[PDB]
Amino acid sequence: LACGKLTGISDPVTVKTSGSRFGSWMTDPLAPEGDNRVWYMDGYHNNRFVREYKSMVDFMNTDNFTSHRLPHPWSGTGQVVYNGSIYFNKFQSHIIIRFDLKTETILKTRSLDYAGYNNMYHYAWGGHSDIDLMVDESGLWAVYATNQNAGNIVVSRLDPVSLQTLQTWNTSYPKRSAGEAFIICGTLYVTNGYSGGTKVHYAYQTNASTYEYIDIPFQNKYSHISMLDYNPKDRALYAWNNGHQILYNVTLFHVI
Ligand SMILES: [Ca+2]
Ligand code: NA
């Protein structure tokens, strides 16, 4: 209740026009003040190259960057950068990989048990987006689905070192009907599509194992969203919008 409940999503802010139709971009919520490097991942299929820009302003105003080449390629757009590592779904697998950016090596590899992959339980936009990793106020999560949950979204807390599952919740929401999803304060928010008409219309509260139908609309400025994640440090939503990297601010309601 203290941490906050989503009540509103701001106008989309265009930060850059770049890259293909589909991709992801993000900052590291546990980077020290003021390490404000931008991490950038173009493409959804068999890709390995991560761009590192020095700052938000360098990201916006230049096309200069450090490149990293992942020893394994990723699927989808569901990566997350967390405490100096990139977490991602190995191409054509339900394998999750922790790639340490400080040493430029893989630190951990592990199967995400029972997770669908290879366009089995993609988000509605497709693109091998079966497994979505994200970070909120309390840590690392994986958002996916399983046969046993009938293709409905499954949410698991993930240990950032072991990559083992710490706790799992089964929701009622068919992942392939979700445009995308993100977590704020332990609540999973799911969008109705990737081109509407867009809005957050389902919330699943993990602390109470309860879901609710809600209506928090937000503007899809460039007509296709293929990535959408919350950053707890920035308190913003990062999105890839049809070859545009955009930010939304949000409002949370707090009860102390
Ligand atoms: Ca997401
Ligand atoms: Na993600």
Residue numbers in the entry: 225 to 480
Quote the study that presented this structure, word for word.
Olfactomedins comprise a large protein family (PFAM: PF02191) with seven phylogenetic branches. These multidomain proteins contain a ~30 kDa olfactomedin (OLF) domain and are predominantly expressed extracellularly in a variety of tissues of multicellular organisms, particularly in vertebrates as well as selected invertebrates. Here we present biophysical, biochemical, and structural characterization of the OLF domain of a second glio-OLF, that from M. musculus (94% identical to R. norvegicus), and H. sapiens noelin/pancortin/olfm1/hOlfA (npoh-OLF), which are both neuronal OLFs, but from different phylogenetic subfamilies. The OLF domain propeller blades are arranged radially around a central hydrophilic cavity.
For npoh-OLF, the point mutation C221G, before the start of the structural OLF domain, increased yields sufficient for crystallization (not shown). The 2.1 Å resolution structure npoh-OLF(C221G), and the 2.05 Å resolution structure of glio-OLF were solved by molecular replacement using search models derived from myoc-OLF and npoh-OLF, respectively. Npoh-OLF exhibits the expected OLF five-bladed β-propeller architecture with a short α-helix; no major conformational changes are seen between our mouse glio-OLF structure and the previously reported rat glio-OLF. Npoh-OLF has a clasp that extends longer than that of the other OLFs because it forms a crystal contact with the outermost strand of blade A from a neighboring molecule. Similarly, for npoh-OLF, Ca2+, but not Mg2+ or K+, confers thermal stability, and the Ca2+ ion is resistant to chelation by Quin-2, except under denaturing conditions. An analogous pair, Trp 349/Tyr 418, is found within npoh-OLF, and in the structure appears to be in a conformation that seals off the cavity. Myoc-OLF variants K423E and Y371D are associated with severe cases of glaucoma, and K423E is one of the least stable variants, supporting the importance of this feature in maintaining the structural integrity of the domain. In npoh-OLF the corresponding residues are Lys 399 and Tyr 347 and the interaction is part of an extended hydrogen-bonding network; the hydroxyl group of the Tyr stabilizes the carboxylate side chain of Asp 356, which helps position this residue for coordination to Ca2+ (and see above). For npoh-OLF, 18 of 20 total Arg and Lys residues are solvent exposed, with a large positive region concentrated at the top face of blades A and B and extending into two small positive patches involving Arg 400 of the short helical turn and Lys 423 of the loop between strands D-16 and D-17.
